[PDB]
């Protein structure tokens, strides 16, 4: 009774079609949902925004277990495929928007799971035009502002700060070496 193509499989499929076919990444980047298209959709939002917010973050109740590893693969593929700046700019812009959204989010384990998972996707992407874009968009400065948008007493705060330090170390190194 379970669906035979779980969202994990669909993500791996799209990661493969992105890695092979140039136009698919741009079509996925520009494609956006519409209000009341599904129970999980509240307003017009991008597929990348949905993958960053609802599928990428670890959440305690399963729908598919390994959706996040494969949304990470999907976003990695959509970055690595050079596709000039058509795909990469919308990926980076949406990652910055979802970071700022989760920082403005109210204090919750949903907030810390989103934040940690976005740090993990920035770190995997980071592992050069993507770095040029992260610099141009001020992503490093939005990572450094992360604790400004935390309650520094939270039991999650150290884990989300560790996560945000992980791309900061690599990025500061890659610049200043």
């Amino acid at each position: 009774s379970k669906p035979l193509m779980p969202t994990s499989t669909i993500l791996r499929l799209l990661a493969e079609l992105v890695r092979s076919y140039v136009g698919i990444a741009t079509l996925i980047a520009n494609y956006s949902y519409t209000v009341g298209q599904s129970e999980l959709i509240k307003e017009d939002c991008s597929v990348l925004a949905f993958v960053l917010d609802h599928l990428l973050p670890h959440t305690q109740n399963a729908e598919d277990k390994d959706t996040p590893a494969l949304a990470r693969l999907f976003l990695a593929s959509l970055a690595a495929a050079g596709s000039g700046t058509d795909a990469q700019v919308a990926l980076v812009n949406e990652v910055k928007a979802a970071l700022g959204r989760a920082l403005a989010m109210a204090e919750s384990t949903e907030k810390h799971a989103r934040l940690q998972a976005v740090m993990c996707i920035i770190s995997t992407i980071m592992e050069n035009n993507i770095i040029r874009l992260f610099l141009k968009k001020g992503l490093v400065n939005d990572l450094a502002r992360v604790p400004h948008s935390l309650d520094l007493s939270s039991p999650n705060m150290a884990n989300t700060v560790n996560a945000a330090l992980k791309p900061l170390e690599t990025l500061s190194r890659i610049v200043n070496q």
């Binding site: 035979l4 193509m5 499929l13």
Partner: peptide
């Protein structure tokens, strides 16, 4: 996409 796990086989995801 609607196909359920009752209707699946070893090669399904490669072949699809």
């Amino acid at each position: 996409l609607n196909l359920t796990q009752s209707s699946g086989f070893n090669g399904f995801t490669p072949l699809v």
